[PDB]
Amino acid sequence: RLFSSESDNSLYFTYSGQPNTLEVRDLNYQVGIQNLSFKVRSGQMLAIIGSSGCGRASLLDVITGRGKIKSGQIWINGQPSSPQLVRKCVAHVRQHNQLLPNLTVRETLAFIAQMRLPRTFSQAQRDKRVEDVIAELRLRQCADTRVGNVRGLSGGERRRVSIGVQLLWNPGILILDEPTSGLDSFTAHNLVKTLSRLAKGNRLVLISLHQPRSDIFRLFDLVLLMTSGTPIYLGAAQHMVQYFTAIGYPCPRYSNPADFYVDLTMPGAVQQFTTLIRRQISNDFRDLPTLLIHGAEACLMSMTIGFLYFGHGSIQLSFMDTAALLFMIGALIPFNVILDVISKCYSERAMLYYELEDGLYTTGPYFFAKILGELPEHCAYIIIYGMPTYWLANLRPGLQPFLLHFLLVWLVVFCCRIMALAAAALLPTFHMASFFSNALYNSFYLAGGFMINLSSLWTVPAWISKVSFLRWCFEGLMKIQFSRRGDKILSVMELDSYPLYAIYLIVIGLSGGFMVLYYVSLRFIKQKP
């Protein structure tokens, strides 16, 4: 009577269909697990207690198919286990929650249902499914509260939201890895009671728990005791002691039996793209601190560039001063751009990997979704960085040169953003990705036509400058600023062999090549955390 018991025992969202089964027969795992064999049916709750897991992968991961090669046989619903069969019939809830902070529970559930339910279902059916999922896990009092890690919800509430997300498509087999990790005693008791109530229907729920101290062991239906990969007991927990005393190993008074026995040893692509871009926009436009920091740094750099090369006053800006100003305008943005893009990409790697492995989308709509989601704030950044400096430096007046400069800066920064995206998708860690990105950036910086004259390069630096967007940006700015004012200064230099539209097409081709590289990296390389 120490725990809360004024709860509702009604089932609002049950499973409709045939009962599911799971069979493991003489399974052995290497690179530990020896002679694992059990049989569970729908309607029962199996908890694997003890020291389970050889290395970085748990027992649930090796029985579900992840992870190191198995040497047994697993049967799912009478049929042998297979990756597509596991994806279609088995749902997994890990111990690390990965949800968007700027979203609420209802919006996230609606997005997951729209990305999971078939296209033939109407909006009313999706709304009814979301309402049933909310009422089943008693999340009606927090359906309009954000899941931000920001106050947001609590730990148990976030776990319930994750379980509801993984339970929206009505799975027949559910698996949980440490659901009560980092929760309070009452919260863990309530979560175990909720999982037991979910197992009360027509579902097969498996749970992995390390230490069921006092009540988690008492609320269990079926338990599996493991020691160094070897099973000891398999059956009802309430009789476990009665089994051990039947062999000659009694449990002492005032001692947990578990620890004492452990230490002894459809819908389509366009719809998915629309939902992804809408979710990304809704999650990005609600992050006030990040947008404010980006705008502040953009305005700071732009205004300090404008004030350092202030063209108004007594003396006007010279030729070399204008060249240095254009080179700095071209070469200062990439650092902050790459840093922000790499940080934003590595802040979503685990979530992207989980969404790609669980089968929501397959690297088709995510690409264009991320592009069109980064497009608007990047364009605002480009405006704030490029337009309130053209007037401070007192450059060539007019509308066409100003618009051409703005478009060239926008295209160059977009190419830099795509390059940073590709660098993030190519390497698994933040440090090596940032190092390779800064190396490429400094290589393209040295390949410019401002420091080494763009002519003292024999074969390789010239070929690098041929694919360097900074050199093309500097040449385009020089042609916009000095041509038809004027051509002889560009003629004595080597910045007059390529017209404006040619430079624009070269920048577009470089952006397309970087996009192709990013797509190949996303499709052929796993985004493992």
Partner: antibody
């Protein structure tokens, strides 16, 4: 969707009584069935609930009448039955028979005075 | 969760607009419904989820939410509006009803 109640009367304290609720126009096994009384001094209080086929026809009652009121259902004729024991202490009401509680109290009946 | 309904009594006539208020002690996230009890004894739900209306109800009733106060507004008062009104919450167990409102004209 029609709900009609019957079986009301006047009974001295210490006895027992059984009210009936006839349903029409929907599946009786796929929906909840609730008894919600309304005494005159009271405003509105739900007393009994019976779940659908998915919950093994489980029943539940509030702490005010836990132990004396028993709800049952007949699926052959789709009839709710409410058996009250030791009435008339403070159990004088206009008991109503409703369909859904968790999805909003909709399609109310007419109520019978006890 | 205690539901405070206002007002307990109100006087109006043909053509005017009435607005009843229901306040919850906790957060229900818009999971509120409105029940109407006719003088004969017929009870019927008019609005569910506090924003959507049922089928077969006149379009003069509507519901809104300001902060923590759920407001049921009925416009173009007619003779069909002499009854009792209650607000009901179903987001938490057990379900609790409102205090009541005697809409008399």
């Amino acid at each position: 969707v029609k709900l009609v109640e019957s079986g009301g009367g006047l009974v001295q304290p210490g006895g027992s009584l059984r009210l009936s609720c006839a349903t029409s126009g929907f599946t009786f096994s796929e929906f909840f069935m609730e008894w919600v009384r309304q005494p005159p001094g009271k405003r509105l209080e739900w007393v009994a609930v019976s779940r659908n086929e998915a919950n093994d026809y489980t029943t539940d009652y509030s702490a005010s009448v836990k132990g004396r009121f028993i709800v049952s259902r007949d699926t052959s004729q789709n009839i709710l039955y409410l058996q009250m024991n030791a009435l008339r202490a403070e159990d004088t009401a206009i008991y109503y028979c409703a369909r859904d509680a968790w999805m909003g109290f909709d399609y109310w009946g007419q109520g019978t005075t006890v | 969760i205690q539901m405070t309904q206002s007002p307990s009594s109100l006087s109006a006539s043909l053509g005017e607009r009435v607005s009843l208020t229901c306040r919850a002690s906790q957060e229900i996230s818009g999971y509120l419904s409105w029940l109407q009890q006719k003088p004969d004894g017929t009870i019927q739900r008019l609005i569910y989820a506090a924003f959507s209306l049922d089928s077969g109800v006149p379009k003069r009733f509507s519901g809104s939410r300001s902060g923590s106060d759920y407001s049921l507004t009925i416009s173009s008062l007619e003779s069909e509006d002499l009854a009792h009104y209650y607000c009901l919450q179903y987001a938490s167990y057990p379900c609790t009803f409102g205090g009541g409102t005697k809409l008399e004209i």
